[PDB]
């Protein structure tokens, strides 16, 4: 979910 965003940057 939205937590995955704390692990890496979306380009």
């Amino acid at each position: 979910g939205w937590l995955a965003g704390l692990f890496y940057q979306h380009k």
Epitope: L3, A4, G5, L6, F7, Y8, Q9, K11
Partner: antibody, heavy 119, light 107 residues
């Protein structure tokens, strides 16, 4: 530089469980991503999973899910990795690494722990 | 499964330019990272976010990522640069390291 110190090399029986510690000396694990990466002898790097101590949320590689556990103790600034149901193929150097939040790169790595899985 | 393909070995004459490729499906759409690992040592971050360099990394190290390929460039390669190099990008919420390349510096 923040220094990540990992526990000593160990021999473990197949089917058993191993727990590796990763002590941050001269830094914190709070507001950071703590990740575990392994390397089988003469092989490549393999990402196991990550954990954010502050948000208490882990993310494990689909292949390690249900077999690995990444934890941390706030007062000691020490991260832990537990790998259960050990197989011969789990023989590897286990690295702990720290990286920034919302940035999937690792700027600080520990020295690695060689875990041998043998009868 | 996502596969990041790198040539197993790359050779460079001293002073020349080493180019280490990493091939992946939607690579240009992902931020690529690069790690240097010397024999018996821990990996060292050399490039992050395709072309950014950490403070302690010589300016002769550069990165680029376009289409299906990221490239690590080492201008004026030296004996100091002999190591295994790993590319790294995220796919389906998982950190994926590339195949790894051993860089041999000729003499």
């Amino acid at each position: 530089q923040v220094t990540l110190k990992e526990s000593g090399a160990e021999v473990k029986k197949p089917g058993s469980s191993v727990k590796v510690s990763c002590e941050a000396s001269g830094g914190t694990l709070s507001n950071y991503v703590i990740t575990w990466v392994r390397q089988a002898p003469g092989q490549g790097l393999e990402w196991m999973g990550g954990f954010i101590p502050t948000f208490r949320t882990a993310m494990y590689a689909q292949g390690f899910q249900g077999r690995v556990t990444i934890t941390a103790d706030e007062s000691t600034s020490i991260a832990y990795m537990e790998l259960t149901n050990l197989r011969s193929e789990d023989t590897a150097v286990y690295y702990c690494a720290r990286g920034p939040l919302s940035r999937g790169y690792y700027d600080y790595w520990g020295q690695g722990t060689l875990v041998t899985v043998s009868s | 499964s996502y596969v990041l393909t790198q040539p197993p070995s790359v050779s460079v004459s001293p002073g020349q330019t080493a180019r280490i490729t990493c091939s992946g499906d939607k690579l240009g759409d992902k931020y690529a990272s690069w790690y240097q690992q010397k024999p018996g040592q821990s990996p060292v971050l050399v490039i992050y976010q395709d072309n950014k360099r950490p403070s302690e990394i010589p300016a002769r190290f550069s990165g680029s990522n376009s289409g299906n390929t990221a490239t690590l460039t080492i201008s004026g390669a030296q004996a100091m640069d002999e190591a295994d190099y790993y590319c790294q990008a995220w796919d389906s919420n998982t950190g994926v390291f590339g195949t790894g390349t051993k860089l041999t510096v000729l003499r």
